[PDB]
Amino acid sequence: ELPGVTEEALRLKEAALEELAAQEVTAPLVPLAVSAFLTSRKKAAAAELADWMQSPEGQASSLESIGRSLSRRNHGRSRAVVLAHDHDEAIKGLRAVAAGKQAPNVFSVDGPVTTGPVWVLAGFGAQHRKMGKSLYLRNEVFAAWIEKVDALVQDELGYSVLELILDDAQDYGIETTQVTIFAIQIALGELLRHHGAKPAAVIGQSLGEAASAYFAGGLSLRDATRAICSRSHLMGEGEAMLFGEYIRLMALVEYSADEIREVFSDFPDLEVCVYAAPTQTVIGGPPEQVDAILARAEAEGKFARKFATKGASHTSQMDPLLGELTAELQGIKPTSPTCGIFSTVHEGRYIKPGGEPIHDVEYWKKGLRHSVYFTHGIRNAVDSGHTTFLELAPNPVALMQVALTTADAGLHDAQLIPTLARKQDEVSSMVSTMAQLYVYGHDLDIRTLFSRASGPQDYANIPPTRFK
């Protein structure tokens, strides 16, 4: 059978749980949903809830019991959610809902978003030391999926990703960044499905393509894990041996594809790694030429930033890895997708649900070797009516690129929903994520955001759980 959690992971987990229990308890973020067929009725419901919450009876009721009772109402066309830690934040946010005013912890819209969400599976440049650790310790569904991928990666590569997540002294390299972000992406998406969410379409970027294939139903979890494991360890081993004239850097520069065609005439060995946004592109090549194009960009007032790597993925430098990558992926079973795919490997084109499989061995070779057409995939999604983009990531780096494409396409009110972020509480982040899916009308059973009631004190004395 599959390997179990290692002894060292269990040791690290015990230590982390002791440290966690020694901290001060912070008040959880509670989602308070109010809805009605008409926005005017929703605003009135918000004002009445706020009035009652200021009464002594409302003050004596926990936010969690108020939220659990609200979660059982009929969820109408016009929706709103207040995210609060205490009664004061709740009443303040509800006043904003009632008065139609905007607030950071308030989401309120007049009706549903017409098209389903695009799940964005990226990850390049998003890793950070403690990513996923807090949610692993505090959410049992997320933890179960982390442990499933951990067991598969143990089987494929012979080490435990969970050990990396739990060990604060450990940081991530070329190889371990990929398998660990993959593990976190799988577990974040399955946590969302557990609460009723589903992608209408997926779009992958760079290392995130393996997770996109799983959530699109194009590969089983085992085969998606083979894809990320085969490429990551070949890339990590190759990058570690690069010195001198063999080094190729990667850098984000504020140049469009049109500008790069002209700019590259001075730098004969530069290649495009990722078309990230309409005016931003990840490029790769020899250090002297990468240094020169960065210096040109800064002289023109344009942004430029290097990544921490001695090798350039999505360039001709990957050629020597493709033969072994072919051999390691023999036997994977591409399947017909169960949702739409905006394939950034295949230049941003759309593959319909039920379409022919795309995730064969040649797809992973092409994805590693050639450019990532990310902005074109996003633009294809915007032009087809999609407005909600949800990024599964330890840090919402790709969502900021998506915002540049959506605004460039004329969509200035897109629903850009992050998941985890460095220096933000990972439990509260997933509450905000799921509350946002709810307010926009996407599939999400808001009842599942609250544990099952054990007694009458777990409800508040308001509709629909009034105590006769």
Contact 392, 121 (CB under 8 A): yes
**Residues near 25 by beta carbon (within 8 Å), at least 6 away in sequence:** none
Report the half-sphere exposure of 311 (CA within 13 A, side-chain side): 23
Pick from 109, 144, 221, 257: which binds Na ion (CB under 5 A)?
257
Phi-psi region of 309 (alpha: psi -120 to 50; beta: other; left: phi over 0): beta
Decide which of Cl ion, Na ion, none touches 257; Cβ closer than 5 to 8 Å per partner kind: Na ion
Decide which of Cl ion, Na ion, none touches 412; Cβ closer than 5 to 8 Å per partner kind: none
Chain breaks in the chain (C to N over 2.5 A) after: none
What six digits make up the tokens of 67? 């939220």
Residues comprising the chain, all counted: 468
Alpha carbon 164 to its chain centroid, in Å, reads 20
Decide: is 256 part of the binding site for Na ion (CB under 5 A).
yes
Interface positions, 78-97, toward Na ion (CB under 5 A): none
What six digits make up the tokens of 30? 């509670």
Angle, helix 63-71 to helix 87-98, in steps of 10 degrees: 40
Decide which of Cl ion, Na ion, none touches 452; Cβ closer than 5 to 8 Å per partner kind: Cl ion
Residue 206 annotated in active site: yes
Fill in the per-residue mask, 208 to 247: x = in contact with Na ion (CB under 5 A), - = not in contact: ----------------------------------------
Question: What separation in angstroms does the CA of 245 have from each of 39, 152, 249, 285, 308?
Answer: 64, 37, 11, 11, 17
Q: How far is the CB of 258 from Na ion (least distance, A)?
A: 7
Q: How far is the CB of 392 from Na ion (least distance, A)?
A: 24
User: CB under 5 A: which stretch of 113-121, 153-161, 167-175, 249-257 binds Na ion?
Assistant: 249-257
Report the half-sphere exposure of 385 (CA within 13 A, side-chain side): 6
Decide: is 115 part of the binding site for Na ion (CB under 5 A).
no
Interface positions, 260-299, toward Na ion (CB under 5 A): 278
Fill in the per-residue mask, 168 to 197: x = in contact with Na ion (CB under 5 A), - = not in contact: ------------------------------
Decide which of Cl ion, Na ion, none touches 256; Cβ closer than 5 to 8 Å per partner kind: Na ion
Interface positions, 11-70, toward Cl ion (CB under 5 A): none
Pick from 74, 265, 330, 454: which binds Cl ion (CB under 5 A)?
74
What six digits make up the tokens of 5? 């959690």
Decide: is 453 part of the binding site for Na ion (CB under 5 A).
no
Q: Which of 65, 108, 206, 232 is catalytic?
A: 206
Decide: is 452 part of the binding site for Cl ion (CB under 5 A).
yes
Pick from 301, 451, 467, 468: which binds Cl ion (CB under 5 A)?
451
**Residues near 411 by beta carbon (within 8 Å), at least 6 away in sequence:** 382, 387
Q: H or E stretch including 383?
A: helix 374-383
Decide: is 73 part of the binding site for Cl ion (CB under 5 A).
yes
How crowded is residue 465: how many other Cβ atoms within 10 Å of its Cβ?
17
The catalytic residue positions are 206
Query: Which parts of this chain interact with Na ion (CB under 5 A)?
Result: 256-257, 278
Site residues, Cl ion (CB under 5 A) = 73-74, 451-452
